[PDB]
């Protein structure tokens, strides 16, 4: 039947980056035509393969993603970029065969009085692994000895974005949908049309 790619984009709410959600879209008949025709995608940067070969190769099992970055963090969601949203928030592998889809939502997921409902992690021991989701809220400290929130050198591991609507084009809530194609030599479940 038709591939359930509509529910991935058209959703009531998206989780934050520190608690990003995924999908298990498999055994479908995809089209890859609702992404090229429209032009509301801010950054349509595919990696690994090209946008033309997506309609011919029979993938085994595709994986979707959903998170909201602080506008200027879409560049950090790339196979090789670093920063504060790509080392302890969402790590992308170098050999990433997928497509990054980001679009602006300065009117659907923003409030003139305040949109303090999205957070991100900025203090974690080491860096993350490709496609790792670390959902935790334990306090952070340079050394061990897990401390209390009231302390001298211990702080919270997450920080709220603080999206507004009276700011520049940089600080705007963007919804990023990272598709990850898994091309295993398995019985083809998701192919192109026709």
């Amino acid at each position, epitope marked *: 039947n038709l591939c359930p790619f509509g529910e991935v984009f058209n959703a009531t709410k998206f989780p934050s980056v520190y608690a990003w959600e995924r999908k298990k879209i498999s055994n479908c008949v995809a089209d890859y035509s609702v992404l090229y025709n429209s032009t509301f995608f801010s950054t349509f940067k595919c990696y690994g393969v090209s946008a033309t070969k997506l309609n011919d190769l029979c993938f*085994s099992n595709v994986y979707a993603d959903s998170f909201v970055v602080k506008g200027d963090d879409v560049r950090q969601i790339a196979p090789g970029q670093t920063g504060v949203i790509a080392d302890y928030n969402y790590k992308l*592998p170098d*050999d990433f*065969m997928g497509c990054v889809l980001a679009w602006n939502t300065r009117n659907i997921d923003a409030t003139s009085t305040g949109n303090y409902n999205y957070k991100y992690r900025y203090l974690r021991h080491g860096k993350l*692994r*490709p*496609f790792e989701r670390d959902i935790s809220n334990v306090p952070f400290s340079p050394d061990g000895k897990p401390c209390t929130p009231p302390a001298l050198n211990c702080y919270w591991p997450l920080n709220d974005y603080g999206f507004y609507t009276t700011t520049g084009i940089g600080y705007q809530p963007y919804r990023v949908v990272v598709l990850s194609f*898994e091309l*295993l*030599n398995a019985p083809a479940t998701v192919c192109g049309p026709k």
Partner: antibody
Amino acid sequence: QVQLVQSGAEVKKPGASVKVSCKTSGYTFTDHYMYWVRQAPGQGLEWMGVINPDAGSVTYAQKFQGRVTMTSDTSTSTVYMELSSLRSEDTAVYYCARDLFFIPAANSFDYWGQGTLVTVSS
Amino acid sequence: EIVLTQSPATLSLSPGERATLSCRASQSVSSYLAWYQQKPGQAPRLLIYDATNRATGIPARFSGSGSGTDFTLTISSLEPEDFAVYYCQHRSNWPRMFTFGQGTKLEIKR
């Protein structure tokens, strides 16, 4: 800690099939690439044996196309390898190793099993 | 497929010198290499992934390098528990292929 426990030895005949299991524990067996390697006595290891335990995704080597068939069980968290048409050159130790990355990505092996000495004689 | 070739295949060194393990491929592959260490009797252990990143639990003496077609794994100070066979692994991209070398055994010079 992550630890992969396998079965014991299994002597088979030249022409039968071998089914060796690989029980996983210590981590979430939902998002992790599983592999299967084999080391001949004195020789090295050469095949991929990548098994995606999510639903049914498999991918085999070139020398092992219709001889090996793998499967997973999300309930017992144990992958199974079924190698048929055992010749006299398959007497080797079979390993099952995990991956360092998650299911969409792939990288080197990080957690290995214990081995399964399989021989073919009387 | 990419055939990994290891030149020495037999490195006899003393307990305290430095190693010069090599791993040269056929074509011009990327930095997607993976060194291992298999103690005789036990199971292989991951040593260096992506040819420049240290794994977890690996001591600081192990430090790999290399890019394109000339890779090298150099141990700072050899230890009595660091004498084993070392394999290097290359991963393909499209048909999920993996290739191993032949193994450069490290023995104690006496």
